[PDB]
Design a protein around this nucleic acid. Structure first.
Length: 610
RNA sequence: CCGCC
């Protein structure tokens, strides 16, 4: 039943210069309002209580303040006043007014058919037209579960690697070419062709959002397939799984994902083969907390769940004469890699890593012991903890094997309770609105804002039981940010799907500026952006300075991502990429010397930690 | 707060 609270009223104003007794009409209208049958009638046409009331107020205001009323309606008013007409004889006119306020009502069925998201496999006739065999490589995080899949892909005549992260799409691109198997890179922000002339290699590595479902592939690898259930990003794994025209689809993920995949493949009638992988070296949950950093030991990783903690723990490590590496998600790619390369290096005294849950996926890290600094983000799910715990790995001179512990004593028994709790299997895969679907809604409801259309679409949508419609909060956020800029729905739609980090004012300001300039057909040149970011940029002096530089970096990424969809309007990507590699460079330095930034933050900006 | 496209 449509949630009528989503329908924003349209103003149907009264009309000016073009017998008629008002104290009478009032009495008629007010009875019109009260007849349990009129209400029950309205209800028939989908006007429940709230819509009835809102339509009625407008209608009654309409009738009462309009200089000239449409002729057919006067005639009907006179009869209920001074003839043998029943209230009911107004209802057809009421209904017309209502439908002008609430156009939804003229098209509930249309709206349902457009948002019918049932039997998603049918969205992919090319994949339906071929034999596809599924190979699920199930194992916990760090069980060499990917390894076999990758080789099969390297030796296939053609293949695609779908990754959960820019990082992993980069790693395989790098590992494939180094394996002498020419491989193109395809991500949102970056598209690299390796071939001399400029033709497509027969191997491609990409972030999952970007893979083609109309190219043939001998082999495809979809990595981290349990992400199919991620509230925001899930739709992308479902697309890859259902739609890749590969002769063998190799998935790699956790056992919790096997059931859903089986239900899915059943509806496609494709064969599935599970292959089990056990953990490389086993998982010993400790007995002694870290208690105090006076036990920090080469190979330790202290995992934090807020940046304040990152700066706090790393500070302490420096005051205690010990050297450390830092890793959090929003560090540029190069810096992350460089920070790990130090923590990994055997000839490097740096042997403590202070990190966020950013490490649970994407980086080659040689960690001996994981130390959960705390256990709260709500406590951390089994999946979450297991993912992270599972990073403890080598150092293989009798320190093979991995260890896990909390920071404090209060926390340790809880970590134990968590890690041996059974994992709920995943129940459904995500879907999302397509641009074309929303474009159709927008034809039906031209006066609804984009953000409101997403809500209405979602309310009207229908999915089979093994699926669910993805979160759209991010998209709705951008839609709200840019409602006041004139753009066709197609263009607006694309701008709203650009991945930005809402929590950063500069990124938001830039989304605005880019969209404004676009709408004004005024290209965003290399020269323009350099003025706008206020370049050149100096080394950071303190944390605020790093955050600001990370922000600018995020703005360059937003530009590049855009340059693939709007090429004339974003014409100088190569140049912007160059300037960004230069910025990742600046950040790397300021990050090497992070302890001094925390100092100038904690002694002058006194950023206290705890 | 984190994670991320």
């Amino acid at each position: 039943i449509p949630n009528t609270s989503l329908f924003v009223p349209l103003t149907v104003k009264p009309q000016g210069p073009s017998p008629l007794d008002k104290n009478e009409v009032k009495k008629v209208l007010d009875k019109f309002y009260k007849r349990k049958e009129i209400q029950k009638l309205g209800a028939d046409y989908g006007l429940d209580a709230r819509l009835f009331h809102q339509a009625f107020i407008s209608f009654r205001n309409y009738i009462m303040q309009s200089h000239s009323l449409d002729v057919d309606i006067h005639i009907v008013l006179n009869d209920i006043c001074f003839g043998a007409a029943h209230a009911d004889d107004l209802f057809p006119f009421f209904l017309r007014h209502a439908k002008q306020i609430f156009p939804v009502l003229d098209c509930k069925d249309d709206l349902r058919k457009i948002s019918d998201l049932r039997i998603p496999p049918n969205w992919y006739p090319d994949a339906r037209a071929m034999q596809r065999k599924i190979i699920f490589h199930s194992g916990p995080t760090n069980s060499g579960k990917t390894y076999h899949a990758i080789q099969k892909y390297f030796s296939a005549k053609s293949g695609v690697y779908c990754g959960p992260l820019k990082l992993l799409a980069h790693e395989i691109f790098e590992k494939s070419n180094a394996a002498g198997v020419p491989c193109d890179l395809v991500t949102g922000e970056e598209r690299v062709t390796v071939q001399p002339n400029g033709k497509q290699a027969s191997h491609v590595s990409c972030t999952v959002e970007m893979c083609s479902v109309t190219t043939p592939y001998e082999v495809a690898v979809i990595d981290e397939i349990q992400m199919i259930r991620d509230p925001a990003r899930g739709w992308a794994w479902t697309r890859a799984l259902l739609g890749l025209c590969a002769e063998e689809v190799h998935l790699c993920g956790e056992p919790a994902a096997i059931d859903l995949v089986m239900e899915l493949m059943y509806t496609t009638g494709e064969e599935v083969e599970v292959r089990d992988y056990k953990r490389l070296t086993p998982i010993s949950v400790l007995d002694h907390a870290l208690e105090s950093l006076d036990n920090l030991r080469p190979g330790d990783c202290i995992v934090c769940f807020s940046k304040n903690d990152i700066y706090s723990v790393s500070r302490q490590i420096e005051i205690r004469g010990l050297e450390s590496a830092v890793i959090y998600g929003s560090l540029p790619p190069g810096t992350k890699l460089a920070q790990a390369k130090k923590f990994n290096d055997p000839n490097d005294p740096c042997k403590i890593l202070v990190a966020t849950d950013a490490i649970g996926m994407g980086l080659n890290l040689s960690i001996r012991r994981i130390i959960f600094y705390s256990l709260i983000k709500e406590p951390i799910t089994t999946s979450q903890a297991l993912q992270i715990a599972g990073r403890a790995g080598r150092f293989s001179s009798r320190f093979k094997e991995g260890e896990v512990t909390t920071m404090n004593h209060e926390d340790l028994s809880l970590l134990k309770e968590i890690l041996k709790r059974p994992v709920d299997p995943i129940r459904a895969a995500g879907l999302h609105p397509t641009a074309e679907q929303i474009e159709m809604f927008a034809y039906h409801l031209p006066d609804a804002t984009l953000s409101n259309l997403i809500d209405i679409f979602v309310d009207f949508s229908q999915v089979d039981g093994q699926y669910f419609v993805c979160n759209m909060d991010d998209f709705k956020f951008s839609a709200e940010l840019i409602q006041h800029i004139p753009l066709s729905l197609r263009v607006r739609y694309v701008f709203c799907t650009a991945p930005i980090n809402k929590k950063q004012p500069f990124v938001c300001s830039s989304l605005l500026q880019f969209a404004r300039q676009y709408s004004r057909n005024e290209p965003l040149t290399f020269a323009w952006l350099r003025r706008y970011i206020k370049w050149p940029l100096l080394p950071p002096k303190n944390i605020k300075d790093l955050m600001d530089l990370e922000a600018v970096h995020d703005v360059l990424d937003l530009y590049l991502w855009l340059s693939y969809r709007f090429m004339d309007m974003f014409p100088d990507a190569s140049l912007i990429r160059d300037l960004q590699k230069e910025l990742d460079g600046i950040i790397q330095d300021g990050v090497h010397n992070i302890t001094k930034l925390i100092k100038m933050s904690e002694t002058h900006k006194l950023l206290n930690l705890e």
